[PDB]
Design a protein around this motif. Structure first.
Motif, PDB file in Angstrom:
ATOM      1  N   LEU C 246       0.839  -1.190   0.000  1.00 44.04           N
ATOM      2  CA  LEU C 246       0.000   0.000   0.000  1.00 44.04           C
ATOM      3  C   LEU C 246       0.880   1.248   0.000  1.00 44.04           C
ATOM      4  O   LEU C 246       2.105   1.180  -0.140  1.00 44.04           O
ATOM      5  N   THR C 247       0.259   2.411   0.160  1.00 48.02           N
ATOM      6  CA  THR C 247       0.997   3.662   0.202  1.00 48.02           C
ATOM      7  C   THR C 247       1.376   4.008   1.641  1.00 48.02           C
ATOM      8  O   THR C 247       0.893   3.409   2.605  1.00 48.02           O
ATOM      9  N   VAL C 248       2.266   4.994   1.775  1.00 44.26           N
ATOM     10  CA  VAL C 248       2.701   5.425   3.100  1.00 44.26           C
ATOM     11  C   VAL C 248       1.541   6.038   3.873  1.00 44.26           C
ATOM     12  O   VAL C 248       1.346   5.749   5.059  1.00 44.26           O
ATOM     13  N   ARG C 249       0.751   6.891   3.217  1.00 39.34           N
ATOM     14  CA  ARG C 249      -0.377   7.519   3.894  1.00 39.34           C
ATOM     15  C   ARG C 249      -1.462   6.505   4.239  1.00 39.34           C
ATOM     16  O   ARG C 249      -2.283   6.758   5.127  1.00 39.34           O
ATOM     17  N   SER C 250      -1.488   5.363   3.550  1.00 36.84           N
ATOM     18  CA  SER C 250      -2.467   4.332   3.872  1.00 36.84           C
ATOM     19  C   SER C 250      -1.976   3.401   4.971  1.00 36.84           C
ATOM     20  O   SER C 250      -2.765   2.613   5.505  1.00 36.84           O
ATOM     21  N   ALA C 251      -0.691   3.474   5.321  1.00 38.16           N
ATOM     22  CA  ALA C 251      -0.148   2.583   6.340  1.00 38.16           C
ATOM     23  C   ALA C 251      -0.730   2.891   7.713  1.00 38.16           C
ATOM     24  O   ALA C 251      -1.116   1.983   8.457  1.00 38.16           O
ATOM     25  N   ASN C 252      -0.801   4.175   8.069  1.00 38.72           N
ATOM     26  CA  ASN C 252      -1.251   4.543   9.407  1.00 38.72           C
ATOM     27  C   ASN C 252      -2.764   4.423   9.541  1.00 38.72           C
ATOM     28  O   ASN C 252      -3.267   4.045  10.606  1.00 38.72           O
ATOM     29  N   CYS C 253      -3.506   4.748   8.480  1.00 37.83           N
ATOM     30  CA  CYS C 253      -4.963   4.748   8.574  1.00 37.83           C
ATOM     31  C   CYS C 253      -5.514   3.335   8.718  1.00 37.83           C
ATOM     32  O   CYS C 253      -6.473   3.110   9.466  1.00 37.83           O
ATOM     33  N   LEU C 254      -4.931   2.368   8.003  1.00 38.53           N
ATOM     34  CA  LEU C 254      -5.350   0.981   8.179  1.00 38.53           C
ATOM     35  C   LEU C 254      -5.059   0.500   9.594  1.00 38.53           C
ATOM     36  O   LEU C 254      -5.901  -0.149  10.224  1.00 38.53           O
ATOM     37  N   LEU C 279      -8.883   9.419   4.782  1.00 35.22           N
ATOM     38  CA  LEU C 279      -8.786   8.290   3.863  1.00 35.22           C
ATOM     39  C   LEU C 279      -8.331   8.740   2.482  1.00 35.22           C
ATOM     40  O   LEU C 279      -7.403   8.165   1.904  1.00 35.22           O
ATOM     41  N   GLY C 280      -8.969   9.774   1.940  1.00 39.53           N
ATOM     42  CA  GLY C 280      -8.669  10.231   0.599  1.00 39.53           C
ATOM     43  C   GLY C 280      -9.457   9.481  -0.455  1.00 39.53           C
ATOM     44  O   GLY C 280      -9.412   8.248  -0.511  1.00 39.53           O
ATOM     45  N   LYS C 281     -10.191  10.214  -1.296  1.00 34.52           N
ATOM     46  CA  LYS C 281     -10.956   9.575  -2.363  1.00 34.52           C
ATOM     47  C   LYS C 281     -10.033   8.866  -3.346  1.00 34.52           C
ATOM     48  O   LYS C 281     -10.288   7.724  -3.746  1.00 34.52           O
ATOM     49  N   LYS C 282      -8.946   9.531  -3.744  1.00 32.08           N
ATOM     50  CA  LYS C 282      -7.991   8.905  -4.650  1.00 32.08           C
ATOM     51  C   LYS C 282      -7.264   7.745  -3.983  1.00 32.08           C
ATOM     52  O   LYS C 282      -6.913   6.767  -4.654  1.00 32.08           O
ATOM     53  N   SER C 283      -7.029   7.831  -2.672  1.00 32.92           N
ATOM     54  CA  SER C 283      -6.394   6.724  -1.966  1.00 32.92           C
ATOM     55  C   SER C 283      -7.362   5.568  -1.752  1.00 32.92           C
ATOM     56  O   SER C 283      -6.930   4.417  -1.627  1.00 32.92           O
TER      57      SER C 283
END
Lengths: 99, 50, 308
Positions: C246-254, C279-283
């Motif tokens: 996944l992406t870096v910004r998605s690492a913490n949110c999950l 979360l981000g729509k694009k993410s």
């Protein structure tokens, strides 16, 4: 064009062709069921607009590159048994089949 | 004229008797089988033959 | 307070027929023991039977061989009734080679180490051409009850050559069992009964051994009565999320939403996953894109969730 009966059937693996001889017809006494191939008949397809993606396809795979479809005789579902006899007939002028 | 080659393949299968099968005498008495009883469950005479 | 039957006066009428006598029995035990023994004998007795055949020039059961009078189906039916005995082996192979005129019998089977042919006058085929020969290989196994050739599918694990003919297996030596109860000769006792069991087999099993085995089977079955008492799977799931890259910004949110396995993630519908913080729509498209990259579309329903 003309429809040819050959053992080599594109898109079909070796396992299904185990019970087919060099001529493409099941061995006498072969026990078949389900949908195993009995004869391998190939139907040709017309292609005359030669496009580069087809060139790449023709280069990587064989000269046919599975362009020709296959319409082979398969046991209808729910039928089983052992092959008893094969009665291939040929036209005058056409080359004789191996069997 | 169209056909260049004919292939005919024969299949043979041995159907054995099973409950749904239909059996009849020659006196109009017909029926379908219901159960395939084991040998030892059938009635036997004093000689033991079922 | 009970008398125990003893196997006395075992008498052998013929090589197939047999009579077994149990002298001391109580008033009513004769019928009980007789029926239990008869049912056991007829139900399950180990025996040996022909399982498969392989003739040289044959291909299937529905063919003919030049020089032989019987069809291959007839030959198989004749072989089915052949009876043998083997000591310590369960996979015996018998070779039959005979050239000449007249019948071919079980007697001309090549003599193996320890394979007893019970009846060597059991004809199986005929040869009518002088320069005709029959050569075949017969497999004999040891079994318990009737087993059709069609039901056995486990033998299809390894491919069989075209020509290996399968025959049905009987495996049961006992053909007919009868019994009778009469009065004993015991005069000091008030009234005792004697049980006599007549057996007709194929000549394979010894009568005394058969009765002994049946009694052993009955006792073993009854041993369970003497003491009653007693009164998410598919491997793509159940994996860590740290394999989809996944992406870096998605690492913490999950991690913030306590999603640590792939399976628990696929159960979260879109309408509520959008309400998650940052979360981000694009993410949200990115996680769907990598989840569809394995064949799982987001929004499935499962039935449970173990900690593992």
């Amino acid at each position: 064009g003309p429809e040819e009966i050959t053992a080599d059937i594109p898109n079909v693996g070796e396992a299904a062709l185990s019970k087919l001889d060099e001529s493409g017809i099941v061995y006498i006494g072969a026990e078949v069921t389900g949908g195993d191939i009995l004869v391998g008949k190939v139907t040709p397809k017309g292609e005359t607009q030669l496009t580069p993606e087809e060139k790449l396809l023709r280069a990587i795979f064989g000269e046919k590159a599975s362009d020709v479809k296959d319409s082979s005789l398969r046991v209808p579902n729910g039928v089983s048994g052992t092959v008893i006899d094969v009665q291939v007939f040929t036209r005058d002028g056409v080359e004789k089949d191996k069997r | 004229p169209g056909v260049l080659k004919i292939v005919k393949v024969y299949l043979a299968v041995k159907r054995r008797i099973q409950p749904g099968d239909k059996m009849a005498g020659r006196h109009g008495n017909k029926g379908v089988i219901s159960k395939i009883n084991p040998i030892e469950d059938m009635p036997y005479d004093e000689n033991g033959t079922p | 307070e009970f008398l125990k039957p003893r196997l006395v006066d075992i008498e052998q009428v013929s090589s197939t027929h047999a009579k077994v006598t149990l002298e001391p029995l109580e008033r009513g035990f004769g019928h009980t023991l007789g029926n239990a023994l008869r049912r056991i004998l007829l139900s399950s007795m180990p025996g040996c039977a022909v399982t498969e055949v392989e003739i040289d020039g044959v291909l299937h059961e529905y063919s003919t061989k030049e020089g032989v009078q019987e069809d291959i189906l007839e030959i198989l039916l004749n072989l089915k009734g052949l009876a043998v005995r083997v000591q310590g082996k369960d996979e015996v192979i018998l070779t039959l080679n005979k050239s000449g005129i007249g019948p071919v019998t079980a007697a001309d089977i090549t003599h193996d180490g320890d394979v007893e042919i019970v009846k060597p006058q059991h004809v199986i085929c005929h040869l009518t051409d002088e320069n005709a020969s029959i050569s075949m290989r017969i497999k004999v196994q040891r079994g318990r009850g009737y087993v059709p050739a069609s039901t056995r599918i486990h033998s299809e694990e390894d491919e069989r050559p075209i020509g290996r003919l399968l025959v049905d297996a009987c495996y049961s030596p006992v053909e007919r069992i009868a019994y009778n109860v009469e009065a004993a000769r015991v005069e000091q006792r008030t009234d005792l009964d004697k049980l006599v069991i007549e057996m007709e087999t194929n000549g394979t099993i010894d009568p005394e051994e058969a009765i002994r085995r049946a009694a052993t089977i009955l006792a073993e079955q009854l041993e369970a009565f003497v003491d009653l008492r007693d009164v998410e799977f598919d491997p793509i799931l159940l994996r860590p999320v740290d394999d989809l890259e996944l992406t870096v910004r998605s690492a913490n949110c999950l991690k913030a939403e306590a999603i640590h396995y792939i399976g628990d993630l696929v159960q979260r519908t879109e309408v509520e996953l959008l309400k998650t913080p940052n979360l981000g729509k694009k993410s949200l498209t990115e996680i769907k894109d990598v989840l569809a990259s394995r064949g799982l579309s987001l929004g499935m329903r499962l039935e449970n969730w173990p900690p593992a």
